Structure 1
Amino acid sequence: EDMEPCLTGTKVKVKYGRGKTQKIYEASIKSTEIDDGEVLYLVHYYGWNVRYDEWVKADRIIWPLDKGLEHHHHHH
């Protein structure tokens, strides 16, 4: 029993900056929700905290879209 999750399989680039905790990570989308008017994503850091993960807004995400992006044989 399943349902289609919120755009899973998509690895994106995520920024998160607060104080010293400023990184730009590669993460996979787990789920997406609308939390108080805005859409927040629950992203899964690839190589980091694998249980709780983190919530970031669309603003802090770099979506795969051609900005001069490679599409030959990594992810066509």
Structure 2
Amino acid sequence: MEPCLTGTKVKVKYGRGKTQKIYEASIKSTEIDDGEVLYLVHYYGWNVRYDEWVKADRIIWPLDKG
């Protein structure tokens, strides 16, 4: 877990420029590296092979936890 961000339903920026898209994902895990937070995200309805570690600036958080 309850105090954790794991399980939070978020949106994630994917790709760059003209072809950037937003995908819905869950937060699976968190990492701290060199003073920054990273999140392992699972894209709903996508194969687990696409789960990825993303920098904090790629996450679009919802209005509430939940």
TM-score > 0.5, shorter chain as reference = yes
The structure having more radius of gyration, on CA atoms, is: 1
Aligned length: 66
Distance 1:51 1:33, change over 3 A: same
Give the alignment's Cα RMSD to 1 decimal. 3.6
Higher relative contact order (CA 8 A, sep 6+): 2
TM-score, normalising length from structure 1? 0.65
Change (3 A) 1:21 1:42: farther
Identity, % of aligned positions: 100
Query: Per the alignment, in what secondary structure is the counterpart of residue 48 of structure 1?
Result: coil
TM alignment of 1:1-76, pairs within 5 A: 6-18=4-16, 22-51=20-49, 53-65=51-63
- For the structure 1 residues 54 and 21, does the alpha-carbon distance in structure 2 shift closer, same or farther, using more than 3 Å as the test? farther
Structure 2: gaps spanning 5 or more residues: none
Alpha-carbon offset, residue 8 of structure 1: 1.9
* Equivalent pair of 2:13/2:59 in contact (CA under 8 Å): yes
Change (3 A) 1:62 1:19: closer
Unpaired runs of at least 5, structure 1? 69-76
